[PDB]
Amino acid sequence: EYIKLKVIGQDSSEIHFKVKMTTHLKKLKESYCQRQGVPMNSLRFLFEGQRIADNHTPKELGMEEEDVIEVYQEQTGG
Amino acid sequence: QDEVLSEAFRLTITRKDIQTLNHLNWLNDEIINFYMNMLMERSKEKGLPSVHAFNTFFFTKLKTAGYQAVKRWTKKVDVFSVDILLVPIHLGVHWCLAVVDFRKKNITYYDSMGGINNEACRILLQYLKQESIDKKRKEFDTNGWQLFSKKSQEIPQQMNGSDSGMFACKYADCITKDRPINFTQQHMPYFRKRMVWEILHRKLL
């Protein structure tokens, strides 16, 4: 069926999404970036430490009702 | 740009990233983690130590939010069933590497700029302590564990303000092969080239 997801940021701001288990999260990620107004390649979406790819589905990742997706920013260093 | 160029380990490296490997550019988390992934891939071969690498977000998270915040990152892997744990470290504008070797039984910090961070190693030993409990339900045996940091005169130092990520990566490359770190700053430019290659090819020369 459907699953309720909570995408949280470092600022602890949380965006809620209602997604279906067998669906690519490439959209949820794309929607999030828009609500933030930043390029895709600007953030990283991790589910329990694991990097969420475009063709990733909550079923595959084994996400459950009311789960969290943490968002991280690009790291650079010299 | 945004155009994906190479991809594997369920990751995707784009042109914007590959460009960070360019002349004197600071590498980003995408390159480090991708490269680290190739090392863990290769670690499957016989004659090499099995390796598990955490992504460049783990240590910071573990340091600022505590164990309770990353305990689920190792839900699908038994940390203690590998020989080497690779811990890339991001220090805001500089890259470092922490390495747990259950064989040599010690946790060593690597800085191409001569920093020391033995604290980082204490954080990691504590971590090993919480994992052994959370996952294997026993108490970790620290007996014999050495927490130390390589001195500037022990490992190749960088001579600019950009190759930190490169050293981090190459350090792990050599370490993962049980071979003495035998390169120098002089090789960096080449190494950078060899990596934009290795990465677009997904194979470590």
Spatial distance between the Cα atoms of B148 and B122, rounded to a whole number of angstroms: 9
Spatial distance between the Cα atoms of B89 and A31, rounded to a whole number of angstroms: 30
Upper half-sphere CA count for residue B65 (Cβ side, 13 Å): 12
Distance between start and end Cα atoms, chain B: 26
Query: Looking at the DSSP assignment, which residues form a beta bridge with residue B14?
Result: B4
3-state secondary structure chain B: CCCEEEEECCEEEEHHHHHHHCCCCCEEHHHHHHHHHHHHHHCCCCCCCCEEECCCCHHHHHHHHCHHHCCCCCCCCCHHHCCEEEEEEECCCCEEEEEEECCCCEEEEECCCCCCCHHHHHHHHHHHHHHHHHCCCCCCCCCCCEEEECCCCCCCCCCCCCCHHHHHHHHHHHHHCCCCCCCCHHHHHHHHHHHHHHHHHCCCC
State the residue range of the domain holding A72: 1-78
Partner-chain contact A75 B11, CB within 8 Å: no
Q: Could you tell me the CATH number of the domain that includes residue B125?
A: 3.40.395.10
Coil, strand or helix at A29? helix
Partner-chain contact A53 B55, CB within 8 Å: no
Please, which experimental method was used?
X-ray
Spatial distance between the Cα atoms of B116 and B89, rounded to a whole number of angstroms: 13
Q: Kindly state the DSSP code that residue A23 receives in the 8-state scheme.
A: S
**Looking at the 3D structure of chain A, how many domains does it have?**
1
The answer to whether B180 and B174 are in contact (CB under 8 A) is: yes
Q: Could you tell me the CATH number of the domain that includes residue A29?
A: 3.10.20.90
Spatial distance between the Cα atoms of A44 and B157, rounded to a whole number of angstroms: 30
Q: Which residues of B touch A10 (CB under 8 A)?
A: none
**Looking at the 3D structure of chain B, how many domains does it have?**
1
The answer to whether B33 and B88 are in contact (CB under 8 A) is: yes
Partner-chain contact A48 B75, CB within 8 Å: yes
Query: Could you tell me the resolution of this structure in angstroms?
Result: 2.8
Spatial distance between the Cα atoms of B198 and B8, rounded to a whole number of angstroms: 12
Spatial distance between the Cα atoms of B98 and B103, rounded to a whole number of angstroms: 15
Coil, strand or helix at A14? strand
State whether residue A29 sits within 8 Å of chain B by CB.
Answer: no
State the residue range of the domain holding B18: 1-205
Spatial distance between the Cα atoms of B125 and B8, rounded to a whole number of angstroms: 31
